[PDB]
Design a binder for this molecule. Structure first.
Ligand SMILES: Nc1ncnc2c1ncn2[C@@H]1O[C@H](COP(=O)(O)OP(=O)(O)OP(=O)(O)O)[C@@H](O)[C@H]1O
Ligand code: NA
Length: 278
């Protein structure tokens, strides 16, 4: 078990509702980590984050390397995503060209195929939770609100009410449960945001967003890559059993076969050089 004194802490990388992420160098190895620190006095979320991430082993996810605790804090040692949030780049450039939209959408699809293959729902997929490593490949994070579906019971629905209003699925709002397909709804919101520069359901307060989501009230700007618009229209479907990529639609094969992805080589995506964003 590692201890606080094993590290030299540097700058704060970010802060959550009740967590702080700090850049740290391990003295004995000289390795850099992002260490997420939670105050104890301020817990199933930390445990859930631990349990879910301990199960993951794919290049498109932040890795959990170690954990420890002292009387005051819980520490999670994570890989450092040097380039930060995908959201920063969307806001910086305003929107992504077709090549970049395609590449990053493909990486998210690949990541979700892996995650869903393990029977795990993310439930809070959004650009803020898609980080970028030094090589500009994605590193999905924020698993404290993810759910491992029980294989013993062939569980499909998760009952915890979690998410972010702009990306939350209509089934969680209306039926009070989410499923793997709920992440494909979020994917469609993210692809839309990459191209249009804002997510599709927008308002100055959450209730107004919920009202639009449940009615599928959104529009495309006049210029939007046509095959990408088709893909978004096959993801933003109210009926969770009718989204391209979902189990009832026969899984990731048909999604990866969408015309928007025609030029994608799905194998070794993580070994390709990402396209420059501008
Ligand atoms: N592995 C990482 N590498 C680099 N930066 C990170 C890493 N993990 C988190 N961060 C940064 O720290 C911020 C806070 O992370 P944390 O997961 O502790 O809280 P959060 O869940 O994002 O915040 P909230 O609880 O308010 O939604 C993130 O938004 C991100 O910018
Ligand atoms: Na969060």
């Amino acid at each position: 078990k590692k201890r606080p004194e094993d590290f030299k802490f540097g700058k704060i990388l970010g802060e959550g509702s009740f967590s702080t992420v700090v850049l740290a160098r391990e003295l004995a190895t000289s390795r850099e980590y992002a260490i997420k620190i939670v105050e104890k006095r301020h817990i199933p979320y930390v445990q859930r984050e631990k349990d879910v991430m301990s199960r993951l082993d794919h290049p498109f996810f932040v890795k959990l390397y170690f954990c420890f605790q002292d009387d005051e804090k819980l520490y999670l040692g994570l890989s450092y995503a040097k380039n930060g949030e995908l959201l920063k780049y969307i806001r910086k450039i305003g929107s992504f060209d077709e090549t970049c939209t395609r590449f990053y959408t493909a990486e998210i699809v690949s990541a979700l195929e892996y995650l869903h293959g393990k029977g795990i729902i993310h439930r809070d997929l959004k650009p803020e939770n898609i980080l970028l490593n030094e090589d500009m490949h994605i590193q999905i994070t924020d698993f404290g609100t993810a759910k491992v579906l029980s294989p013993e019971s062939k569980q499909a629905r998760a009952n915890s009410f979690v998410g972010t209003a702009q990306y939350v699925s209509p089934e969680l709002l209306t039926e009070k449960s989410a499923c793997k397909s709920s992440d494909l709804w979020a994917l469609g919101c993210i692809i839309y945001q990459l191209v249009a520069g804002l997510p599709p359901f927008r308002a100055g307060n959450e209730g107004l967003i919920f009202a639009k989501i449940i009615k599928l009230e959104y529009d495309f700007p006049e210029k939007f890559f046509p095959k990408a618009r088709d893909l978004v229209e096959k993801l933003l479907v109210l009926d969770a059993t009718k989204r391209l990529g979902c189990e009832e639609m026969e899984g990731y094969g048909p999604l990866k076969a969408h015309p928007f992805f025609e030029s994608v080589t799905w194998e070794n995506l993580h070994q390709q050089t990402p396209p420059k964003l501008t």
